[PDB]
DNA sequence: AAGCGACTCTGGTGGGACTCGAACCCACAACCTTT
DNA sequence: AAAGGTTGTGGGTTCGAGTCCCACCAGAGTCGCTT
């Protein structure tokens, strides 16, 4: 099952920071590196025959200016820094001069502007339908990044800048009665004012219901700042609150969100793990949203303080077959071991079980990933071992069974600096480096990202047919396995065709028509893009037929909403009569529901024309055809594939696959089409941006 | 690709030198795949607004009006014999629109060629507001500035246009290597020939262009092909074709398409044999073309020369038959690296070891092995002998325990002494007078012997042939180049150990280069060189 | 089994020193010829990596923020090989060239009590050197040679393997008068050392029987002025650097004796 | 005067980039080369 | 008699070597001000 996928991705700069590889729900892979964040965007390319992974590459630049954590007045801090560095005590003086938090830049110190950590938001956080990237530098600049156009990442906000000012405005006191304004000239208070705002790691919540998302930032002193962002996130404008909770955990290493549901009651908390070993779930006692609620009291998952640093945390929702109820499985990397804890609400409240699955590695675990759909864990160490670790349900709680996957057999002797798993578990991505060659060191070090197939084509095909999520973009990594097979064998495997026809016959929801359209477009590319010409014409005819079907279903739904809201007698933003004419144009499709709907509409429609005009002419556009409109002067305007209005604006939206086009919403548009314009592309479910 | 993006892409496929407005329309009209719009005057205003409203596009006035573009189409794409020839058919090499003037060491990191980069002025804020609203129509802009209006895409857009979506933006290139890539980009589907880049674009040594092209091959930004130039001589020249990956198309060749037909013919003929005449007649080919195809098929190893009697095909008839070191050192804890490297070199002993072979044996970087060799030479514990093998004058290193007794030493010392003898024996139609290693001294000595024993020698070929046989008797696998000899003969000329005399003689309507070499004791007026000229002219006579 | 491990070097990590003044910090050097300073709270990136020549041992003297480094000579420029003090980076001083050495310095030891450093060479010479107060910029140290002296040099005197060397040579140990450093730069051991530095050529046709492999100052306040060293000969030699022992050391030894004798009886 | 801490002034080497010298290769015309 | 494999040519390709030259280094010198 595990075999390499063809393109290795070369990295220009050293891999950098904590747990440096991640794979977003949006199929963008980020590697945090000394001079950038490289982002690898996986495209199920339907326009080319190449069997490789089509990886579009972008990067976030490293900052040009080093970040100073604000601890006082610009002069007050300067005299303090002189005092400590000049101190004749070896301890005070060397503690100041060695710790890079106090010294983010210097005369002979390398600048720490590369990236410490990165976290991907859920989808829908961006101004487009996409996810945001939270990025942390090693000089503690925490920033939120988005790729609004395709080409260039822009910083939306710097959260360290805001939080520094908000601490300064409260004299670094969280409760104003609780502490003095301690003198900055005391090294303990000086260190504290740095420690209280040095971010360790951060994680996004799920989407809270108007949408909202939280971001929890963990600080070295055990404070956590819970940011609340309004969605879509557009900058400082969307920051609805910041609230700091004092965890009290000493030397906190890692953070993750716990979110859980039982009896449709929502609950949530923050799980936090110390570098000194223990793991605890905090109740998030403060939040503004009304639909969620929070855990009542902290629960201790591991108490031992054995100083095995909790390097990573992941958790997955599960349904336990024998307890016959939903439960949450937590897995945490602790040194070379995996700690696991299963959390199960019952009539007793929380029932909790835990263990260490042991003997996995002879070196500490350098990265960990959870297969969200199964709880399959992967774990990795710099000796190049990767171990697949399968949760098996037990009459109470779990057992874990595990196996090594031989990267030696696919890449040879290799070092692995990180792993990530695709959102459906289709691929494992690995940061490979030159390994020890028969006990010799490699002379030259070159980081790469490499991919291996975790699933067979037959399992990817089956899981797409039985897909509960029923959106192709949620499953680009599975349809890429299907794509690879079709391009490799230049035919659609018969069992997939037969099963898909059975689904289209027995269910026929537009997801299966979208899946058919994908297979046929990849088939067309496979056969070199006159029996071959006859076959090309045949399957292109089939593509056009199913492409036409998906169009009718969308047009029917649009008119099936024009009929429901107040009649737009001015015909303001939809070519209603043109669409009615287009639907009535043939008797070939018998669907009475459309034919009566256009009856009711055409009864209600105004006798005034309200035609669409070509802006270069102020002459009518007839609405002859799906894709584009033309006028007597010969201008050609594309039509918005969501609303069929002509995209005459100098900027308009394009699908991720460029298979489809959409208009930008305007203030003249009613709310209901401003919502309609947020639909994914009707042909490929990709963001239309 | 979308029409609006195809506009901005075309603006970004010119380099930092950018476009004039009439050049832009010419680029859109010549685009492949075809530009979707009819490009009417109203459309040109719409596209002009699409430029002005785009924040990455920027506009300049240059000090002088730019020339308009030629018809760029490089290739013939026709033949009168079977098939067609897509060899380069040369347009007039008019004054280049985009002469190379590299923007070196730029502090903002923007790169490319622009002859006016320091001299042109920004007029963005004249053409648009800072709110990106267009201030001028296209007709107003072209009326006000004409060809002096220059459109340039941002560096981020320009570099993207060179690497495509799969390319990595983090990759910095040297300015010279970027300007090669940029020079490819503006050529679109018809890449520049490497010959032409060094000859007339960059005006550099072919070694310089190759060297700077290496990084583009290493990162894989460009694709390499052999390509064919049909000269007005009627003869046709080999040269490399460089295509930026976006624009790669596998170019065919007349001999390639015709050899496929012969390969198909012979492979479908169940004997895999046919006579040359029928192989010609089935393709209508002349013998002059076909004999290339025959010898290509032979040199490709696909077929074998065969002859059969006509009664065997059913008089002997010509036919074609188709048919198709040093061990690694374990570093010890207990000795320094200089000691351990010397221990290696003593183990090799009389044969020595090279710096590159030390590096692989010691598992060290290139700069690290270099310092090991430098120090051991300076300590006088190891001695370095040059050795020519392959294309490379390497050094082999031998410890002073063995260095004197080494074959490299003994052979070098013999040829040094032999050279000292051969030098010290020196005496105290229109001719023109021209301006260490063991094998190099052997070649020098052999020439000095020849001019000592034969005070004239009639051509550089005669020098080469004896040298080639002499080295072949020694068993040398490499074959001595003409340029190596003529550069060697130049060295002896500057040492004054010979004269080389060159001219072209003319006879019976044909011309011959003479390239006489003579002992320094005679000048071009000597009856011997005159006799040589006459006897060359005799044998050149009809 | 360990609680923490991290990949400090891309090649064998030959030497560690752990910071005394604050044990959150550690330094390591490896045969990638980098010196890397670490913050053990934050092991993912070093505080400072300085690429240098290949190094054999490090010493971190308590009062000074930087580290003094002993080099293997195989990559140093001829005449610039030796021993360097290197600031960890905040003060930003250039490396201070405390002593030129021709051979590789195999081993190094900093006396915290003396603030001096001692170093053993394949030349078979043991030197000591006094560092300046490295809170102050070393570039003002206009003549560092006044701050170093030899302890001894071993010479082979005629008389690739041990028996063939031992049968035909003996070790002449030449010892300095460490009783005082008067007229130091005119005394023959300094001239002998100064004619060694820069000009002398390393010998590779022998076992290196004279080479010194370890050097250690006493960490104890009692005997603080004593040094031990040993090498390829398997001889081990002890020296008292009488000139650096001092009344404050006696003053402190007696007061510490009194306090100790009061605490334990 | 004798002394000090910047501020220079002077010979020497390496780091990466790059000139260098060589063989190797095209395709043609010359014709030596063969039944 | 009656003709083709065999070869030399002008120019481009290319391959790994040693070379370049600037910045940096270690030492010695200068001298405004102090002691
Ligand atoms: Zn029109
Ligand atoms: Zn689409």
Swiss-Prot record, chain A:
Xref: InterPro entries: DUF5921, GTF3C4, TFIIIC_delta_N, TFIIIC_Znf, WD40_repeat_dom_sf
**Source organism's superkingdom?**
Eukaryota
UniProt entry keywords in alphabetical sequence: Acetylation, Acyltransferase, DNA-binding, Isopeptide bond, Nucleus, Phosphoprotein, Transcription, Transferase, Ubl conjugation
GO cellular component labels: mitochondrion; nucleoplasm; transcription factor TFIIIC complex
**Pfam families xrefs:** DUF5921, TFIIIC_delta, zf-TFIIIC
Which GO BP annotation is one of this protein's? tRNA transcription by RNA polymerase III
Please provide, alphabetically and separated by semicolons, the GO molecular function terms listed in this UniProt record. Answer: DNA binding; histone H3K14 acetyltransferase activity; RNA polymerase III general transcription initiation factor activity
Q: How does it assemble?
A: Part of the TFIIIC subcomplex TFIIIC2, consisting of six subunits, GTF3C1, GTF3C2, GTF3C3, GTF3C4, GTF3C5 and GTF3C6. Interacts with BRF1, GTF3C1, GTF3C2, GTF3C5, GTF3C6, POLR3C and POLR3F.
- Which family is it part of? Belongs to the TFIIIC subunit 4 family.
- What name has this protein been given in UniProt? General transcription factor 3C polypeptide 4
Curated annotation (Swiss-Prot), chain B:
- Per the record, residues carrying Phosphoserine are 493
Write out the annotated subcellular location: Nucleus
The superkingdom of the source organism is Eukaryota
This molecule's function is given as:
Required for RNA polymerase III-mediated transcription. Component of TFIIIC that initiates transcription complex assembly on tRNA and is required for transcription of 5S rRNA and other stable nuclear and cytoplasmic RNAs. Binds to the box B promoter element.
Q: Which family does it belong to?
A: Belongs to the TFIIIC subunit 1 family.
Q: What quaternary structure, including any partners, is listed in this protein's UniProt entry?
A: Part of the TFIIIC subcomplex TFIIIC2, consisting of six subunits, GTF3C1, GTF3C2, GTF3C3, GTF3C4, GTF3C5 and GTF3C6. Interacts with IGHMBP2. Interacts with MAF1.
This protein's name: General transcription factor 3C polypeptide 1
Source species of the chain: Homo sapiens
| Lineage summary | Eukaryota, Metazoa, Chordata, Craniata, Vertebrata
**Residues included from the entire protein:** 1 to 716 of 2109
Curated annotation (Swiss-Prot), chain C:
This protein's source sits in the domain of life called: Eukaryota
Q: What task does this protein carry out?
A: Required for RNA polymerase III-mediated transcription. Component of TFIIIC that initiates transcription complex assembly on tRNA and is required for transcription of 5S rRNA and other stable nuclear and cytoplasmic RNAs. May play a direct role in stabilizing interactions of TFIIIC2 with TFIIIC1.
Q: Where in the cell is it found?
A: Nucleus
- What protein am I looking at? General transcription factor 3C polypeptide 2
Q: Which residues carry this modification: Phosphoserine?
A: 246
Kindly state the subunit structure of this protein. Part of the TFIIIC subcomplex TFIIIC2, consisting of six subunits, GTF3C1, GTF3C2, GTF3C3, GTF3C4, GTF3C5 and GTF3C6.
At which residues are the WD repeats? Answer: 1-51, 52-87
Task: Read off the lineage from the record.
Answer: Eukaryota, Metazoa, Chordata, Craniata, Vertebrata
Q: Coiled-coil intervals in this record?
A: none
Source species of the chain: Homo sapiens
